[PDB]
C-alpha cells in the first residue's frame, strides 16, 4: 500500500543553465505539419532530419 | 505510452508510399512503412525505467 | 603491436594524405624533414603534451 | 604459409583503399594526383563529370564516377557503402591474422 | 622543445587545458575549429532567437 | 565545446565560412608535419635534464 | 537496382528517376556493361575473398 500514500517531492531538479547536460550533436525529427508539407510538395525525396 | 499511443511512426526513406489523410499518414502500397499510434517502446527511450 | 600497426598506418598515410590532397613522398621542399628517423620516432612515441 | 595469405589480403586492402580514396576525392587536383600516383587515367564526360579508369591486380580494370564503381572482368556495379564493407572485412581479417 | 614568447592570447589555453605549455608549434584542429565557432557565434549574436 | 561535426556547422551558419574550414583542415597538417621534421636538425644541440 | 534498371529498358519509381545519373549511364555505355542484378554480389565476395 506504500504507493497509495500521499507522497510529495523529495528531489530537486538541477539548474540546466549550461548545455552538454541536455543538448548534443545529434539529429532529430520535425513537427508533423512540416512533415506533411514536405510529403505533399516533395514526395520524391527522403524526409530530412 | 500516452505519447506513443498518440504519435505517428514513419520511416523517412520512402515517402512515395505514404499519403496525407486528416492530419496523419496512411499507406497506399500494402507495405506498412508508417502508422498512427502504438503501445510499445523504441530503442534508447525509458531504458532506465 | 602498437609499434607495428603504427608504422603500418604511417606508411599507409605516406602513400596518400587526404588532407594534403597528395602524397608525402612527393614533397621535399615544403615539408623537407620527412624521410628521417626522428620523424618516425616522433610520429609514434612523442606525446602531444 | 601465413605470410602469403597476409600478402594477398594486403594487396586487396591496398586496392580497395586506393579506390576509396579515388571515389572520395573532392577536387580535380586530388583526382589527378591519385591517377598519377596509382597509375590511373582521368577522362572527362559530356555532362561535366570526371571518370577515372584504373587497373588493379585483385579486381581488374575499374571505372569510377560520382561514387559509383564498375568492374568489367567481374561485371559488378558497386556503390560506396558496399566497397567500404568489403574493405572493412579485409581490414579485420588482415589485422586479426597479423 | 622550443617555446614562443608569451602573449595575451595564450592564457586561454592555460585556462582550457592546464598542465600545458606555450609552444611555438601550430594549434590543433580542435582548438582552431573551436575558435572559428566562437567567432561565428560572436558575429551572429542578434539573429539568434 | 559541442560543435564538432562540419555539417551542423555549415548549415547553422553562412556559406563563406565553409571556405575558411577546409583550408583549416589542411593548415594544421602542414603545421604539424613541418614541426615533426624540424626535430631532426636540432638533434645534437640539446642537453639532458636531471 | 534502380540504376541497373534505368541503364536497361526497364522502368523505376520517380524517387530515383529525379537524379543526375546521366554521367554514370554514359560511363556504363562506354564500357559495354552488364551487371548481375544485385543478388549475386555477396556470392561474388564469397569467392573473391
PDB file of C-alpha atoms in Angstrom, chain E:
ATOM      1  CA  UNK E   1      61.159  21.767 -27.156  1.00  0.00           C
ATOM      2  CA  UNK E   2      61.113  25.300 -28.484  1.00  0.00           C
ATOM      3  CA  UNK E   3      58.940  27.863 -26.704  1.00  0.00           C
ATOM      4  CA  UNK E   4      57.294  31.008 -28.048  1.00  0.00           C
ATOM      5  CA  UNK E   5      57.398  34.440 -26.465  1.00  0.00           C
ATOM      6  CA  UNK E   6      54.405  34.950 -24.206  1.00  0.00           C
ATOM      7  CA  UNK E   7      51.404  36.972 -25.354  1.00  0.00           C
ATOM      8  CA  UNK E   8      47.923  37.635 -24.013  1.00  0.00           C
ATOM      9  CA  UNK E   9      46.060  35.307 -26.408  1.00  0.00           C
ATOM     10  CA  UNK E  10      47.690  32.226 -24.824  1.00  0.00           C
ATOM     11  CA  UNK E  11      46.257  32.303 -21.287  1.00  0.00           C
ATOM     12  CA  UNK E  12      43.050  30.814 -22.700  1.00  0.00           C
ATOM     13  CA  UNK E  13      44.999  27.616 -23.371  1.00  0.00           C
ATOM     14  CA  UNK E  14      46.224  27.597 -19.773  1.00  0.00           C
ATOM     15  CA  UNK E  15      42.578  28.023 -18.758  1.00  0.00           C
ATOM     16  CA  UNK E  16      41.272  25.432 -21.235  1.00  0.00           C
ATOM     17  CA  UNK E  17      43.986  22.756 -20.862  1.00  0.00           C
ATOM     18  CA  UNK E  18      46.066  23.270 -17.698  1.00  0.00           C
ATOM     19  CA  UNK E  19      49.251  21.233 -17.208  1.00  0.00           C
ATOM     20  CA  UNK E  20      50.136  22.608 -20.655  1.00  0.00           C
ATOM     21  CA  UNK E  21      52.871  24.679 -22.277  1.00  0.00           C
ATOM     22  CA  UNK E  22      53.017  27.571 -24.753  1.00  0.00           C
ATOM     23  CA  UNK E  23      54.906  26.048 -27.671  1.00  0.00           C
ATOM     24  CA  UNK E  24      55.687  27.750 -30.976  1.00  0.00           C
ATOM     25  CA  UNK E  25      54.084  24.848 -32.863  1.00  0.00           C
ATOM     26  CA  UNK E  26      50.762  25.132 -34.647  1.00  0.00           C
ATOM     27  CA  UNK E  27      47.401  24.936 -32.922  1.00  0.00           C
ATOM     28  CA  UNK E  28      45.476  21.651 -33.031  1.00  0.00           C
ATOM     29  CA  UNK E  29      42.474  21.245 -35.375  1.00  0.00           C
ATOM     30  CA  UNK E  30      40.087  21.030 -32.419  1.00  0.00           C
ATOM     31  CA  UNK E  31      41.140  24.393 -30.987  1.00  0.00           C
ATOM     32  CA  UNK E  32      41.050  26.035 -34.429  1.00  0.00           C
ATOM     33  CA  UNK E  33      37.515  24.768 -35.025  1.00  0.00           C
ATOM     34  CA  UNK E  34      36.625  25.961 -31.523  1.00  0.00           C
ATOM     35  CA  UNK E  35      37.926  29.457 -32.283  1.00  0.00           C
ATOM     36  CA  UNK E  36      36.054  29.590 -35.589  1.00  0.00           C
ATOM     37  CA  UNK E  37      32.821  28.504 -33.888  1.00  0.00           C
ATOM     38  CA  UNK E  38      33.402  31.189 -31.260  1.00  0.00           C
ATOM     39  CA  UNK E  39      33.851  33.827 -33.961  1.00  0.00           C
ATOM     40  CA  UNK E  40      30.707  32.669 -35.765  1.00  0.00           C
ATOM     41  CA  UNK E  41      28.696  32.861 -32.536  1.00  0.00           C
ATOM     42  CA  UNK E  42      30.112  36.296 -31.710  1.00  0.00           C
ATOM     43  CA  UNK E  43      29.319  37.702 -35.157  1.00  0.00           C
ATOM     44  CA  UNK E  44      25.783  36.289 -35.436  1.00  0.00           C
ATOM     45  CA  UNK E  45      24.658  37.135 -31.896  1.00  0.00           C
ATOM     46  CA  UNK E  46      21.478  39.016 -32.887  1.00  0.00           C
ATOM     47  CA  UNK E  47      19.734  36.731 -35.388  1.00  0.00           C
ATOM     48  CA  UNK E  48      19.732  34.052 -32.671  1.00  0.00           C
ATOM     49  CA  UNK E  49      16.233  33.541 -31.254  1.00  0.00           C
TER      50      UNK E  49
END
